[PDB]
Amino acid sequence: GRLIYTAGGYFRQSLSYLEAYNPSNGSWLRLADLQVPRSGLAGCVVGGLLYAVGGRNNSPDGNTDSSALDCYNPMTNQWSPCASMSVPRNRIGVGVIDGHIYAVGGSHGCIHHSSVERYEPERDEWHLVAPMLTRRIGVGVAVLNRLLYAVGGFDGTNRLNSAECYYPERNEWRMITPMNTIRSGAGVCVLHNCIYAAGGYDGQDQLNSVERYDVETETWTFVAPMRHHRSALGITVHQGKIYVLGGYDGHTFLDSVECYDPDSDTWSEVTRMTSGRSGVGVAVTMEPC
Numbered sequence: 001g002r003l004i005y006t007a008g009g010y011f012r013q014s015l016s017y018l019e020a021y022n023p024s025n026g027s028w029l030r031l032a033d034l035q036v037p038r039s040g041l042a043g044c045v046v047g048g049l050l051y052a053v054g055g056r057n058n059s060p061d062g063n064t065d066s067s068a069l070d071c072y073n074p075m076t077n078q079w080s081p082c083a084s085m086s087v088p089r090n091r092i093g094v095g096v097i098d099g100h101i102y103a104v105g106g107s108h109g110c111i112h113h114s115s116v117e118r119y120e121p122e123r124d125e126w127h128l129v130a131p132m133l134t135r136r137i138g139v140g141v142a143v144l145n146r147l148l149y150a151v152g153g154f155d156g157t158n159r160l161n162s163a164e165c166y167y168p169e170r171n172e173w174r175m176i177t178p179m180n181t182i183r184s185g186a187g188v189c190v191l192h193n194c195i196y197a198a199g200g201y202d203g204q205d206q207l208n209s210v211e212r213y214d215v216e217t218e219t220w221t222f223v224a225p226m227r228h229h230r231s232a233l234g235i236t237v238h239q240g241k242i243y244v245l246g247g248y249d250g251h252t253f254l255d256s257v258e259c260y261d262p263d264s265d266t267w268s269e270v271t272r273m274t275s276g277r278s279g280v281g282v283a284v285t286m287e288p289c
């Protein structure tokens, strides 16, 4: 559509915020709160509807991993509950193929999932598919040419540079070339023929580096680093540019929003979120009402 939506996230506790940024004019709009606060969720769009998937409610009265799927209709400014997933999935990644939502990995307490499940909006149903070859939480997910990619993350013991690809018609996962950088909670998205992985955490440091995988060459190449080191960032594509939103730099929960121009290989500061936060869900759709 035309707006970048940011849902949930974390600052001091899990957040219920839904806010929409308009790159055309720089404005932010605050919209209807999520029914349940959540950080470590993912956002996606199917048929112009915005979905918030998984996460965890870290609140002063308990911590609860979410198996929730909720649907935001920009036409009504209302959130509606959908069928819940088979399992809670905190620090989840998601991808959309052919109008179906894949929920990938994430944690439930000390359980780090390799499992994957697929949502069909037409029947409001989840179904498990083949699990990944690797347990991954803080996993980056993107879709390119109707193939689903799971990139980096944390397996319970180590942060990962590994990545793998799901071939739907074979219901099968296969490893791809690993990234040059260990990244957990990177922002992962697609632009042109490349899967980009921006920032993340390696067990020691939050990262500013950005690399991209060309499916034709099966190789990863670094591009210009972001202006800010950041893990648990939100990422999306809007008009052929990558936008990264918030995250954590080892010091501050960032309000910084940066944009990448692939043609000039440059990052620029574009706006600030209304407040600093990390672990948001982000996606793009039409403006409300």
Ligand SMILES: CN(Cc1cc([C@H](CC(=O)O)c2ccc3c(c2)nnn3C)ccc1Cl)S(=O)(=O)c1ccccc1
Pocket (backbone or CB within 6 Å): 009, 010, 039, 040, 041, 058, 091, 137, 138, 139, 153, 154, 159, 184, 185, 186, 200, 201, 203, 206, 231, 232, 248, 250, 277, 278, 279, 280
């Ligand atoms: C930071 N968010 C949670 C989150 C963490 C990680 C990794 C997990 C890991 O590699 O173990 C992680 C862990 C620790 C990190 C890290 C990344 N970066 N710095 N530090 C110290 C990856 C994605 C998300 Cl959304 S969040 O915003 O949802 C959040 C923040 C505070 C408390 C709870 C959740």
Ligand SMILES: [Cl-]
Pocket (backbone or CB within 6 Å): 040, 056, 090
């Ligand atoms: Cl968490």
